[PDB]
């Protein structure tokens, strides 16, 4: 169970990073830092469900 | 060359014929000389800067060691080895003296620091000097190696141990200055060579002597079979 239940989350996180990466600079800790991110249900549904 | 040959020819006869009884009291004595002769004649040889004086130290101050190195250990099974080593030493010494005379006359200096670059200006003389020097060092394919070898192999075969080890050790030590001057031959740092080898119009008698004395420093070391077969018939 955990194999898939974690691989899905990793792939989703990668997708979220590359989706929001054009708004903030091309930089880790400027992206993939979910405190300046936050709230994406409206913008990318298919990778949110 | 000839002083050493004549002295070593007189010594064995003057010490073996009228001194049967005193063996155990001069066998030791000569040993005390040899153990010193092959040491004090090498250390100083390292620090030298003149060619003639360095040759005096090395080729005489020391090399008059392993000749004696069997006179003490002799039951008439060794004298052949002394004859062979003398025959090797005469040639391996006259070669380097001929080369030194030739270069000194052609340039006008003696000190070591002027032999730099000599390989590039005239390579034949540098090669025929390096050959004799290495032979003096006693390296396997040359003649001095087999000389020292057959001098030890008969002299270890006679019991005495604390003279062969010192001989080999001081030979290893003697390798140093030989390789030093050899290194000074092979070089190409144009801004280092003094204006002595720089003006050297390279080019009979001395050439003939040097070239027929240097191949006798490489061939007999491998062709010592008839020389050995000849040197065994000595009873005196």
């Amino acid at each position: 169970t955990h194999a898939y239940s974690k691989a899905l989350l990793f792939l989703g996180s990668g997708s979220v990073i590359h989706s929001m990466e054009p708004l903030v600079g091309y930089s880790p800790d400027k992206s993939q830092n979910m405190v300046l991110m936050g709230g994406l249900r409206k913008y990318i549904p298919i990778t949110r469900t | 060359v000839t002083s050493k040959v004549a002295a070593s020819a007189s010594a064995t006869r003057i010490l073996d014929i009228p001194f049967y009884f005193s063996s155990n009291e001069w066998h030791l004595l000569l040993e005390i000389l040899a153990i010193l002769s092959m040491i004090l004649g090498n250390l100083l040889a390292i620090t030298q800067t003149s060619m003639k004086r360095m040759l005096a130290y090395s080729s005489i101050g020391q090399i008059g060691y392993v000749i004696i190195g069997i006179i003490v250990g002799d039951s008439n099974d060794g004298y052949a080895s002394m004859i062979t080593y003398m025959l090797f030493y005469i040639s391996m010494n006259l070669g380097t003296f001929a080369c030194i005379v030739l270069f000194g006359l052609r340039t006008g200096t003696d000190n070591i620091r002027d032999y730099a670059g000599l390989y590039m200006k005239d390579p034949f003389l540098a090669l025929s000097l390096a050959l004799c020097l290495l032979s003096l060092g006693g390296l396997p394919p040359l003649a001095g190696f087999f000389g020292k070898l057959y001098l030890f192999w008969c002299g270890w075969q006679a019991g005495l141990y604390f003279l062969v080890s010192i001989g080999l050790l001081t030979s290893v030590l003697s390798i140093y200055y030989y390789l030093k001057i050899i290194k000074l031959l092979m070089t190409g740092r144009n801004q280092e060579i003094t204006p002595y080898v720089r003006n050297y119009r390279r080019s009979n008698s001395i050439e003939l002597s040097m070239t027929v004395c240097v191949i006798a420093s490489t061939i007999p070391g491998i062709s010592m079979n008839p020389i050995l077969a000849i040197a065994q018939d000595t009873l005196f």
Binding site: - | L134, P140, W153, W156, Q157, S165, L168, L179, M186
Partner: protein, 499 residues
Amino acid sequence: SYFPWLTILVVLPIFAGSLIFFLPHKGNKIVRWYTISICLLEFLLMTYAFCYHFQLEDPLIQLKEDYKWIDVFDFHWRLGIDGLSLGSILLTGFITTLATLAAWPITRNSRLFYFLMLAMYSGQIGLFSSRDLLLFFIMWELELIPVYLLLSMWGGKRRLYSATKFILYTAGGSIFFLIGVLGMGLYGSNEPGLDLERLINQSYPATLEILLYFGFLIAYAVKLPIIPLHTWLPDTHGEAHYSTCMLLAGILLKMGAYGLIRINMELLPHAHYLFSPWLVIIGAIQIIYAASTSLGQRNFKKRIAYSSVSHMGFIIIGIGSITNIGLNGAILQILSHGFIGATLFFLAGTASDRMRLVYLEELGGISIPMPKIFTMFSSFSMASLALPGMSGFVAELVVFFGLITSPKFLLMPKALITFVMAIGMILTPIYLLSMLRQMFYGYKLFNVPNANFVDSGPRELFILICIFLPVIGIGIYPDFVLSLSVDRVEALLSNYYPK
């Protein structure tokens, strides 16, 4: 068969290189081809002699012959190949051909150089094919001058100090060897004595076995680096041209192991069986000491030198721990190290001479300008890490198996020594990747100008690939170097007497 092969195989290189002299033709061009053709011819003759004129099924000597040379102290042209010799002979031919190729763009002298290369070639094969003890010694010391000249003419900044230390040290080490020669030569010289084959039945008295054993062991520890006798290696490796250093740290080191196998374990058993455990202990502590001092160095050439030092502990521990595989795994180890160390020194000398920076701290990101060097360097670093697949693994594995199943041990040091040996696997990557990370990773300045920075051309790349492929081929199916049935007679003598 009676058509002499080994005589030809020994007198071909030096002879056919003596024609380089007295040949006024050019500056550099023609000599390179005239030397590589001779090298390839020699290697082809070697493999022809091995393939259809060898058996792999009998532990005697093959292709032997002899003559009369000096006849006073019985010393002949006695010469013969055997199981132990064959692997090292083939490896020498191979790696020296490839070294002579790697020495392609040398135009300083290019006439003395290739001749000296051929001389070292002939000397190595002469030693590895010897059958008469004095002739073994002659071949041993014959190479001492050519290597000194190659050091003092080409290579490194402080070439002189390294060269003189090396020559003095090796010449001094050979003194105890000559002592052993004089010792066991005079021991009943009527019985052949100087015929390395007919010495298997010698029964020497006590307190003399030990002295000859030590007289050979000191010289070997001089040649093959053992801990208290290793100080010469970093200087004579960090200063040598990579062309020289390839054959130097891939063949000349392994002579110290081949001789120790051939004249100690085969001739002086009760002088070696009462001295094996200390050999094992010394090798075990060497495996970790060499690495712990390698990690400290700061110029990667000396680091590679120390990495070569470290792997010489597996050979030691395999010589001790008297088994069939422990001795047999040592041979595979000398082969799989003559490959790896040689290639690593070639890569170190090829990366350098392009950057002219020796200290491992200023090496920027060289991965951006030259990818292929980075790839072929990481690959051989992995090989040196004892990584499986490559041949750097199976050798150490068989060494472990030989130590474990050894009969001359009862479980007390048979485990602690294995532990201290396995610490080497924790220790080696710490100093290999520490170099791989400083010198290659990271993004240095914008090294866009394609000047003094060009990836390896066809020659160097082919050399790297042609040395690499044997590593994989051996590490996948090692039994391409277990064609050794002499150990079934080599370890036959020792195996029952006391203790």
